[model samples]
Target: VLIFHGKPVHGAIFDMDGTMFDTERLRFQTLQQASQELIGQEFSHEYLMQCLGLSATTAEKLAQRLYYKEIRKRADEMELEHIRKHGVPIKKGLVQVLERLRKSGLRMAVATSSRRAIAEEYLINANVYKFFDVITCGDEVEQGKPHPEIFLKAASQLHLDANQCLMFEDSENGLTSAHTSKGLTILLKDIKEPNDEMLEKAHFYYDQMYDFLTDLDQFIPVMDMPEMQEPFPQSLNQLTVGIHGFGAIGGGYIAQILSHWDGYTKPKRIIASTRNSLFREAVNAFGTYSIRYGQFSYDERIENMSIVDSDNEQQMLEMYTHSSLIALCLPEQAIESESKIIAKGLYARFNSQEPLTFLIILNKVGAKYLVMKHLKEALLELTNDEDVTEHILKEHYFCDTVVNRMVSKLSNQNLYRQLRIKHNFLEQHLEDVEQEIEDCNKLTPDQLNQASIYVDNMRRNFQPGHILQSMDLILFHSETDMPIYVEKGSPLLEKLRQVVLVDQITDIQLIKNRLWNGVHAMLAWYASLMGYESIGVAMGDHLVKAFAENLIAEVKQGLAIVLPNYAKDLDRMSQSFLDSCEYAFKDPCQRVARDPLRKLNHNERVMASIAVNIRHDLPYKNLLKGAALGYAYAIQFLEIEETKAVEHLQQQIQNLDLSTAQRRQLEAELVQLIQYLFS
Candidate 1:
C-alpha cells in the first residue's frame, strides 16, 4: 500500500465503460431500441439500469435464459442490428485524460467484468490501451466486481494491497467491488441518481471528469485525505412484520409481537399498516419493535402511504414477495371481503410461483369454508383458467385457526403497568394503564403462568413441539383418537390433561363470548330500551354497570362449571372487562353510541367480533338470545311481516355480525314467527 497524507493512497483503479469512455448511454439506448423491436415492448429505463455494464456474452446468455428460444434469437439479432444502423461513438476527452494521467506517473489498472473481446474492442476503439498500465477483464477472473475477485486481481497485478487502490466506478455493482476490496471509491453519476446504499459507501461524487480536473487543487487534497463520519450500518438478521389494521385483536397482536422482538434477525425493513398515521408514528417512537414508522425524526418525513398503497395492487404484490408471511387478523365477518383483495394481489404478481401461505387467526367454523372458497374463486378469476389456480394453490396453504388469550384494545396505562408492559410508541389512549397482568387470588402465579410457561418450557424442553404432545400426556397412557377438527363433541378423552394448549385457549374465548361480549350485548340492548345510543354511554349509567357486573358474575359462575380448574382464568377475565370498559369510553370509535336500529350494524359494530369469541358451554345459544331480541326490534322498526324481514335480517346478521349466536334460533323462529305474524 502506498502512503499519502499520513493515510494510504492506493493505485488508481478504473471501471471499463463510462469511467474511461462515454459509451454507457449509447450501449443502453442500443439495447433499448433492440428490445423494443424484438419483444414488441419498450424496455423501461429502470430495466436497462439492471443490465448496465454486462458483457455481450453475459447479456446474450441471460436473454436466452429469461426469454429463451425464438425470442432469444430476436434479442441476439437486435444488438448488432442497432450497431449497424447507427454507428457507436466514444465520449470526448477520454484519451486526453488517460494520457495525462499516465504521464503523472501514477500506477493505473483497468478492472471490469466485461468479456475479453468486448473490453479489447472498446479500449482500442477509444484509443485507451496505451494509457492503462494493466488490465483485468471478466475472462481473466473466476468472478467479477461485486464479488471482489476482479479488484483483487487488479491489486495483485499491481503488487499492492487492496487499500493501495482507489476505484472509480459509474454503477452500483462496480462500486460494491471497490468497497468490498477495501479500496476508496469515487462514484461517477450516470443516468441513475445516488441511492442510500451508494451514498454510504462512496467517498466522492463528481458530475464529470472535467469537474474533477478543473478543481484538482481542491479535489486532490481531499482525495488523499477524506474526512470520516460516524458509520450507521444496521443489523441484518432482524425479521420484519407489517401488520394491517389496529382494531382489538390487531392492536393486541402488535403489543404481543413487540414483547417477543429479538432484533437479531437484523430486519432490513419494518412497517405498520394503519389508517392512523400518528399511531404508526407512536409505534416507531416506542421502539418496542424495530418498526420504521412516522414518530421518529427521519420517519416523520416518510409518507404514510408508503408501506402498502391501498390503490396500487402492483406495489402491494411486490411487498408480499419480500415478506414470507402476511397475517390477516381481521374479525371473521371481514375475512371474505379482505380475502378477495389479497387473492387479487397474488394473482397480479407475475414472477414467483410460490405464493405466500396465509395464516388466519380466526375462529373455527363452517363459514371458514365459504371465505376460502371466495378467495379461491377470486384468484381463479384473475388467471386464464383453473389450471393456473391449481398451480398457485399448490404452493400456498390457507389455514383457519383459533387464538385464545385475554388481549384487550384498551389503552389504559394502569393495565399496561399491571402487565409489566412498557412502550413509548403507544397512542395516548393506549399507554394510560401500564401494569402486569397479575394472577388471580384463586390460582398461584406459577400455576397461572404454567398456562403459558408450561407451554414455553414444554416447547423448549421437547425436541420438536408437535401439536399432539400434550394430548398423549392428558390421556394417561390410554389410546386416543385424533379428531378431524377442534369443535364441540370432538373428544374429551384427556380432560384437564392439557393434551393441547388449545384447551386453555378455547376456554378464554368462551369466557370472552359469554362473560365479556355477552355483557356488552346485554347492556347495549338494555340501553336501547332506555333509548341510550351505545354500550359505553348506557354502561356509564350507574345502574347499567351494576346490572352488567352482576350478569358478568353469573356468566363467570357458569363458565367455571363448564370449565373445571379454570375459575381463576375466568375471574381474571372479568377483571379485564372491568379494565377495558374504563378505557372503552375514551376510544372514539368504540364509544360512538350510535343506535343499531337507525343504522345497520357492520362487522365490528355488531357481529364477527362476537362470533370468533364463542367456544364451549354452547356460547352460541346465549348469542341466539341477543339475536332474537334484535330480530324482534328489526321487525318493529321496519314495519314488515316477519317473513319479509327475517331473510334480510339474517343476512344482515351474518354479514354485519361475526358472533355465532342466534343462527339456529333465528332459523327455527323465522318459520314460526313468519307464520304467526303474516298468517
Candidate 2:
C-alpha cells in the first residue's frame, strides 16, 4: 500500500499515554490527591475511569460535570506537578522496537490525545523522541479517540494514506481511531485488557511491545521483496538465531557468541525462549542486559534481543522456520518434555526448504542420540513414516556440542543491590580470596580494579529492593580453555567455523565428563559431608585435596590407555579443574551435589568411566572408590537406614555382569566403604 526506503512498508503509528508510556496512572493519582484535598473526599474511581482515553479538554469538561470548577482546575494543576515529579514510565520494549524499525528505514509517527507541548515533552523526557519522524497531537486535530482524525493526521504527516499505515494503540477509544483509519491496528495490553469489541477491531493484540517485536517479521511482511524470502542467508545480516533456554549456560553461550561476533558469523537477531512470565516481563522492560565473567573480568551488554514464551506456538513456529540455528541448553530430562514441541517446530520449518540445525548442549554422554530418539519418535508419530525420520537424522542437522563453562546462578538479591553501591562490597570479597590463588599475585593493580562480578539484567528483578524474588544473577568462576565444540560435518558448524571448534566434540565431552565432572562430583560429595558450603572452601581441607589428587592420578592412568592422543591434554585439564575448585568462585556444594540420582546413572560422569575401566581391565580402585563416594552421597537422600542402603548397594553390585567371584569381592569392598563414609 505504501513504500518506505525502497521496501514495501506502510507507516507505523503509535498511540500516546498508556501505549507509549504509563502516564494515565500518574494522572489518576494526582486527580485523587487534588479531589481529596480540595473537596475533603476522594474522586470517584468510576468517573475517573471514563476519562482514560479522552483529550485534556474533554477530560476537564467531564471532571467539571462531577465536581466544582475550582476542584477541576486544581486537579489539572496537580496532574502537571505529578508529570514533572515522576517524568514518565515508558512502556516496555518501545524504545528498542522503535530503534530497530528506524534502522530498517521504516516510517514512524506518534498519534496522541495530549496537547502538542505535553506529548513532545513526555516523549523527549522518555529519551525516545528521535525515533519518530512525525507526531500528531490532539490539539492539531478537530477530534480525538473515537474519531479517526488523530490517526488520519498521523498517517497524512508521514506522507501515507490511512490504509497504508500500521497503528499501535493501548485503549478501546484509540483502537476505534485505528480501526476507523482503515490501517492495521495492533493493541498493546498495557494497564488494561481489550474487551471483545476492542479485540475484534484490532488486527493483532500483544501483551507487550516485546511480543509484537518477537513476531515483527511476520506482521510486517516485506511483500514483493525477493531478498526477504530467503529464510537463512549466508550473511549474518539476514540470519536469525533462536535460543531455547535463558538460564546460566544459555546466557553464557549468548555472552560468548556476542563477544566473538563478527558480521560474517553473527546473526542479525537473537531470540530467547522462556516459560517464566516474570523473567519475560523484566526482559521486555529493559531490552538490553549485561553478562559478566567475574573471574575473567569480562563483561558485555547485549541489546535488542526479542523474547517469546515457549508455549506460543505461532511465534515458536516462525522462529523455527526462520532460524538457521536453535541451541538447546536445557537439562537432559527437560529435553524429553520439549521434544514434541521441537518436533512440531521442525515440522513447521520442513516445508520452508531452509537449512536448520538443532544443536544439543547437554552434559550427559550419548545426549545427541537421546535427543535424536525423542525427535524421531515425534516425527514418526506425526508423519507415520520412518523414512522421513531417518532422512532428518542422517542429514547431519542434529548436532551435539560440548559446553565447558563453569557458571553458577546467584539468587541473592542483597548481593545484586550491594554491587551497585559506590564501594561495591563484592570487591572486598573478591580481593580477600585473591591472595590464595597462585596466579593472583601476577595480576597488575589495574586488572584487580575491574568488577569481577558480572550482573545479568535479564535475570535481575530490578524491583524495589526487598526479597528480590524477581531476579537472577550468575557468577562465573572460570571459563573453559577450549571453545564450543560441535560435530565435524554439521552445516551449522560451517557457518560458525571461526567461532566454534569442529570434529573434536566427543573428545572434549570425554575429558569434561570423565575427568572434570567426575572429580567435581567426588569433591562436592566429600565437601557436603565435611560441612563445607562450597567446593573452593572444601578444597582447602588437606584431606579433601589429597583425595582429589589421588582421583586425578587414577584418571590420568585410565586416559593414557583409553585415549592416548588426549593424555597430555587431559593431564593439564585435570590440574585446571582442581585449581578451579580452589579458586573460591562461590560455587556452592549443593548445586554440584544436586541430582545425585542422575549422576549415578550408568552413562553419567561418576559411573561412565568406571564402566570403561572395567571393559579395558585397567586398574580402577581409586575410580571405583570415587563411585562409592557417589553412592554414599546419594544414600543420604534416601529414607532408608544406612544398613539397608548398604544392602541396596550390594544388590546393584550383584546386578553388574562381572564374574560371581568378582561381584562378591567388589560388593564386600563397597559395603565396607559405605560404612566408613556414611558413619
Candidate 3:
C-alpha cells in the first residue's frame, strides 16, 4: 500500500483532456476538420502525434513550423469551436469512478496541458468539473508535459507533497511528467497506446479509467479498525449463503457484504433463486454477474453463484439445507408462496443440520409476523405434533431486517446487453405504468462493439451502474465497516455481530414505517397531484413544505404517545427525513407513491399511524388528510381502473372494522375530500 502518515494513499491528481474525457480522438478529429478548412489538407498522423500532448504555446510553434501562423491560429480556433458546439465525450465509468474518489475525501486536482479556459469548459460540459479541488493548466505553468511543473503545481495547490499525489495520465509525455513529479503514476492508455518506456515509467497501466478504479482495491490493503468487529469468525473454507431474490435489494446486500470482507470470510458460493429465465441463463452461462454499487472503488461479482428456479422444489431444498444463512428478498405478496417451499426444506433438514438462520429482508409492516404465520401453517402440515413444529422454530432463528440501500434501474440499452439481465422487480409493485425493456437492436455493429467492450469491462471488474447519491452514498462504501442491522437475540446476531447492528428492532421498524415511510408516501402523493416528477420537486413547493412541517409536528406528537422514549429525538429525526427528501436523492414520486392501495391499509404506514393518533386523542386531522389525499390521488392519477381504486378504498375501509356510525362518518369525510380533489 502507498502509505503516508500511517494512512493509505491520500491525494489524487489527473490529466484532464484525454484521461478524463474521450476528447483526444474528438480533438484529433476536430483538428482534421480545421486543417481541411484552413489548409485545404489534413495534417499527417505523424505530425499530429508529435504535437499530441504539447501545451498551446508549444503546439502553436509546432504548427507554425509545419505551416504558417495564419493556418495555426485558424485551426486552433476552429477546433475549439467544434468542441464547444458538439461537446466532449466523457470516458466510460468516469462519473462512477469520480463519485467513488470524491466520497473517499481524497483531495483531487486536474493537471492538464490544455489552458484553463479550454480545460474548465471541457470538464464542466462533461458534468465532472466539480469533482476536482484544483485545476492546474498548461498556460499557468512555465513548462508543459514531459516537465513536472504542472503536476508539481497541482500537488502544491492541494497542500500535499508530490509523492503523496496519485497522478493519472494518458499521453506518454504527460505520464513522463507525472513520473518525474515524484508521485505514483497511472498510465491511462488512450487513442495512442503506451510504449515500453511509457509503461516502465508508470507504476500501473490501464486501457480504461474504470479498470484502474476497479483494480485499485487490490493495491490498498483492507485494514479493520481497532473498534471494528468481525461479522463472523474467519474460517478455513468459505460458507454457502442463499439469497431468494436477485433483484435490487438482493444484489445490493451481496455487493456490500462481499466488498467489505475478504479471505475465508467471503462466501464460497451464493445460491440465488429467481424465476427470470434470462437472469438465470446469464448466471448459468457466465458463472457470475456484476454489482455496480454506491461509491465503492471496486465493483463486486458474486462468484460460483448457482441459479435455482424457485419452482424447482428439490433444488431449493438442497440450497436451504446447505446454506447456514438464508436471506429472503422476495416481494411481500410472494412471501407466503415462497415460505411454503422453504417450510418443506426446513422440515427435511430439521434434525440433520445445525440450526438455520433466516433473514427476512423487507420493509413492509408486520413482515415478520406475516412470514412466521405462513411458515407456521406450512410446518403444521408437515408434522402432526404441534410441539415438534414449535421445537423446530425454537432451534431455527427468524430475523426481520431493513435494507436501507438504494439501487436504481438502468435505462441505457447499449450498456445492458453485456450483462443481459433486467432488474425489473422495482417496477413490480407499480400500478398504471408501462414497464418496457430498453431495446438497442437498431445499434450498429460498431456501437454494439463499444457497448460490449464497456459492459465487458464492468463484468470483468465486477462493477454495476446502480448507485445511491446522498449521505447514505458514503456510508454504503466504507471499507472499515458497513452495517446491516437485524433484531438482537436472534441466533444469527452473534454471527453477524460486526456487519449487523442488533437492536430493539420493533422500535426501528415503527420509526421507519410510521415516520420515514409514512411521510415519504404522503409527500409522494402530494407530488403526484401537483404534477411533479419527484418528492424533491414537491419539497420545493411552499405548500408542500408547509404541509411537511405540520405533518412532522403531528408525527412527533402522536409517536411520542405511542413510543415516548424513542420519539424523544423527534426533532432530529424529522430534520434528517426532510434533508434526505431534497434534490440530491432524486427519489421519484411515482415510485414512492406506487402500491398506495396496500400502504393505506389498516396496519400499514398511513392508517396504522392514524389509528395511533386517534387512540391518543392527539391532532389526528392532518394524518387523516394525508390518507385522504393519497386515496384520492390513487383514484385519480394511478394507472388502476377507477373501479379497482374504488374497490381498494372500500376494502381498506371495511378492514378498518369501524362501527356503522363511525364508518358512515368516515365515508362522508372521504366523499368530501374526493370532491375537493376532483373539483
Candidate 4:
C-alpha cells in the first residue's frame, strides 16, 4: 500500500505517443513526407499498419527491406523539423490532468515505445516532464507493447501492485499489454475499435485524456488531508432545496413537482422563504398546504415543507448554507435584496469549496444577470479582496430557465372558515367576482364602497394563531403541458415532467420573451381594450388571435436570420407558446398586463421584438400596430386625449434606443399606425 497526503494513493500508467500528445499523427506525417520524397510515393499502408503499436517483430524485418536505414534517419530529421517549427502539439487536457494528479499525490508513469532521448525531449517541450515519477521506454524493454514487459517495468518502478494502478491506452498494442497484465484498463479512443474484449468493455473507460480530466475525481479519488467519501452526490436524503420565494408558483407549481419526486436524487425537504408574514405563519401553523390542480380539480397536499420569514437574517443564512440546489422564485425587484443575503452563503461555500447550482425561476429575461448585479457587489464588499472575490464569483453556476406555468393563490375568510376546505373553496366565488369586475368601469361610488366594506370585513376575521384560518393555491398546468427549457451543460436537475434540457437556453429565453411573453402582453392590452377579461377568452377572439399571429410571424423572421438552427423547429415552437397562453383559462389580462412600463421598455418584449425586425430589414408593421395597441391601452393613465395619445406614442418610440438611421425609418410607420388606431 502507498500513502500520499495522508490518503491511500493509486498509481496511473499512461501511453505517451497518441494518448497524452498528438505525436502519433506527428509520426505518421514524418513517414509520409520522408517516403514521398525518396520514392515519389507515400509509405505503404501495410508497413504503417504493422508498426502502429510496435505489435509484431515482423514489422522491423519489413522496415529493413524498404531502405529502412535512410527512411528512418530521414523520418527522425523530419520529426525534429516539425517539432521545432510548430512546437510539440500536446493534446487538449494533458497539462491539467498532469498538474492535478501531481498535487493529489498520485504516482504517475509513462510507458512508451519511443527511445529515452526522444521521449525526454517530447515531454520536456510540452512542459509536463516533471509530472512523471518514472519513464520506461522500448529501448529499456526486451520487447515492445503487445507484451506486458514495458508496463510491468513501469509499475515496478512506481512501487505499486499492478492491480492498484489504472492504465490508460490509445492503441490495441497498449490495451493488449495492459489486459494481459494486472491493472484496471482505461482506453482513450484513437484510430478505431478493437474486437478484443479489452477496450470495448472495461470498468474505467474514456474517449480521450481530456474526458478523464473533466471528471477526474470519478475515475481516481482526489482526497484531502484527513480524506472524504462520496465526493459528488453526497445524498438525495441530504438535498434541501432553498426556494427563495414561496408564492403561488413556488408553492403550487415547482414545490408541487418536487413533492412527488421519486427520482435517483430525491430531495429530502423544501425550505421556502416568503416576505409575507401572515402567509408564512399560516403555512407553518397548517404544517402542510394543498395545491388544487385546476383542470383536474384534484388537491395535492405538499408534505415536509416549511415556510421561513425572509426577514429573519439567521434563518435565511442557515437555509442558504444548507441547500445545495437553490431556486430563485422571487419577483424581479426581490432579486437584489435576496442575492445580497445569498452572497454570504456563497462566500462561506467558497471557503469550504462546495458547489451551489443556482436555478433562476423568474419570468424576467436575463434574470441571472439581474440577480448577479447585486450578488457580485455584495460579495465584493464582504470579501474586500479582488483575488478572493474573483475566486468566489466563479464558485456557483447560474442556469437560466423559460418558465411558463400559470399558478394563482387565494386564502379563506370567516364566511368559508367553517368548511375547512382550503383555497379551492374560493374557486366559485372568485370567478363570480372576476365576472363582475369585467364591467368594473361601470361601477358607481356606492357599489365600490359596498365592495370595500366586504373586503374590510374579511381583514377583521383572522382567528387566533392562524392567519385567516386556511389557504390554498390553484395550478393551471393541466390546460396545456408545462415545459421549461433549461440551459445545457448544467447538471441535470432531474428528469421531471415538463423539463426540457436544451442548448442556447438564453436564446430560448429570448424567443419566449419575444413570442410568448411579448405576444401575451400585446393580447392582454388589446384584449382589455376590447372588453375581454381573461387570456383564454382573449385567445378565442378572432381579431386578437389573428393580430398576435401576424406579430409572431414578424419576430420569427427576424430570429431566423440570427438563430437559424433554433428556428428549425420554430413553426411548432411558436405553436407551443401560443397554446400555453390559450391554455391559461383563468389568467387575468389585468394580472398579465401589470407592470406596463417594464414590458414596454427599450429592451423589453414589445420594443425588443420590433427592434429585431427593424434591424433585419424585415416588415414590422404588424409589430408597430401591436405596440400602438399596448400604448393606447396604457395611455388611459397618461392623462390623454387622441392628441395626447399621439404625443405619448411619439415619446415611447423615441425612447426605444434605436439608431438615428433606424429611428427615422420607424417614426413614419408607427405614427401612421397610431393615427389610424386612435383617430
Task: Point out where model 3 deviates above 4 Å.
Answer: 1-236, 258-264, 283-304, 351-353, 383-388, 409-482, 495-498, 533-546, 583-587, 643-651, 654-663
Residues 1-679, candidate 3: write the lDDT tens digits.
2453344677889887788887677657767776687768888897778776778777777776876456645655766676778766667656655655555578988998987877887787776787898999988898887789989999999999988788888887788889889897888878787788987898877878767755754443344421323333222123567888766556545434532333213455678788766667755765655554333344444455678898998889887888867888877779878878888888878755456778888778768998888989988987767988888778777887765544443323423443332334223323323321135688877787788787766654542222211101111111222456677555334434234654777787877788878888887787778888766668889988788788788877888888889867778868877876754234457667878878888778887776666556677677778888887777787656667766776677676745667655666776677677777
- Per-residue lDDT, model 2, residue 333, is 67
lDDT for each residue of candidate 2 in 1-679, tens digit (9 for 90 to 100): 3343233565689888888788787777877887788878887888767777778776777766876557656765776666678766766557646755665566899998888877887887776787789998878787777789989888888988877677888877778988999987889986676789988898778888766865663333332211211222222243677788766666555444532333222465777787755556555654644555455555444554777888888877877888867888788768877888887787777656646777787887788888888888888888787776676667537777776556665444533453355235435444554321135566675554442322233223332222223222322333433356678655335434224646767777877887888888877887787788877778889988998898787777777787898887876788777767776556678778777657766557765566566666776787777767777777774344566555656656665657787677767776677677756
Off by over 4 Å in 2: 1-236, 263-265, 412-482, 495-498, 611-621, 637-657
Which lDDT values do the candidates have, in the order given? 0.51, 0.68, 0.69, 0.69
What's the best-to-worst order under lDDT? 4, 3, 2, 1
List pairs with backbone clashes in candidate 4.
none
What lDDT is reached at residue 560 by model 4? 90
* Each prediction's TM-score versus the true structure: 0.38, 0.55, 0.53, 0.54
Worst 10 residues of 3 by lDDT: 468-477
Better of 3 and 4 by TM-score: 4
**Candidate 1's C-alpha lDDT?**
0.51
Order the candidates by TM-score, highest first.
2, 4, 3, 1
What is the C-alpha local distance difference test score of candidate 3? Answer: 0.69
Give the Å error, residue 644, model 3: 4.6
